[PDB]
Paper text:
However, because of the intrinsic flexibility and irregularity of loop regions, organizing multiple structured loops at protein functional sites has been very difficult to achieve by de novo protein design. Here we describe a solution to this problem that designs tandem repeat proteins with structured loops (9–14 residues) buttressed by extensive hydrogen bonding interactions. Experimental characterization shows that the designs are monodisperse, highly soluble, folded and thermally stable. Crystal structures are in close agreement with the design models, with the loops structured and buttressed as designed.
The in silico validated designs span a diverse range of shapes with different repeat protein curvatures and loop geometries and adopt multiple loop buttressing strategies using loop–helix hydrogen bond networks and loop–loop bidentate hydrogen bonds. From a fundamental design perspective, the crystal structures presented here show that computational protein design has advanced to the point that proteins with multiple ordered long loops can now be designed. Key to this success was the design of dense networks of hydrogen bonding and nonpolar interactions within and between the loops and between the loops and the underlying secondary structural elements.
Numbering used by the authors: 1 to 205
């Protein structure tokens, strides 16, 4: 399962700044010439997932290079829903970046998540514990910084307008409405006013 796309993404991940730039230009030319955007490495990691790992771990230059390449992969037809072997999906992984990333990483991930949803990512596809994107993003409202709270608010609205199940519960029974009311009880005045707006948005959906 070795291809030019995967070898070159490896150079974006590990090469010098000059090597990264040349690898990005070679990747675009391969994609433009029809290289398969879906052919995965020996671990079931897709080009999309591998470049999202670069957004999660890379320098500010690497995050920009990977954001550019991720947009081109999605325009090339990369499957926005394909998971790796451990069950990680691009939507879930990008939500992890919102939860743990720097302010620069959060912005990249917010831009990518919108592109992912426009490409057909499943807004209902959950992780192992059964947490939906909806639940995971409400957890960021609860525990994030003010800037994470704001991005999560934006993503939640875009996720409901993309058809997310307002009532879908996780494996333990937890619901978005349950979590939002806990934020209403325990959160800051800013969080309480956000959780109230989100409860009305949940019902309306």
């Amino acid at each position: 399962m070795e291809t030019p796309l995967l070898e070159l993404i490896a150079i974006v991940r590990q090469g010098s700044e000059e090597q990264q730039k040349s690898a990005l230009e070679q990747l675009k030319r391969l994609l433009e010439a029809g290289a398969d955007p879906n052919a995965a490495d020996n671990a079931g990691k897709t080009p999309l997932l591998l470049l999202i790992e670069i957004v999660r771990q890379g320098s500010e230059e690497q995050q920009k290079a990977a954001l550019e390449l991720l947009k081109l992969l999605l325009e090339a037809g990369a499957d926005p829903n394909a998971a790796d072997n451990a069950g990680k999906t691009p939507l879930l992984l990008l939500i992890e970046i919102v939860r743990q990333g720097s302010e620069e990483q959060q912005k990249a991930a917010l831009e990518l998540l919108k592109l992912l949803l426009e490409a057909g990512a499943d807004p209902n596809a959950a992780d192992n514990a059964g947490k939906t994107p909806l639940l995971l993003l409400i957890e960021i409202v609860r525990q994030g910084s003010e800037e994470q709270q704001k991005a999560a608010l934006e993503l939640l609205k875009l996720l409901l307008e993309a058809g997310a199940d307002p009532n879908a519960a996780d494996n333990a029974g937890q619901t978005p409405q349950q979590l939002l009311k806990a934020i209403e009880r325990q959160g800051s005045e800013e969080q309480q006013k956000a959780a109230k707006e989100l409860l009305k948005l949940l019902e309306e959906a």
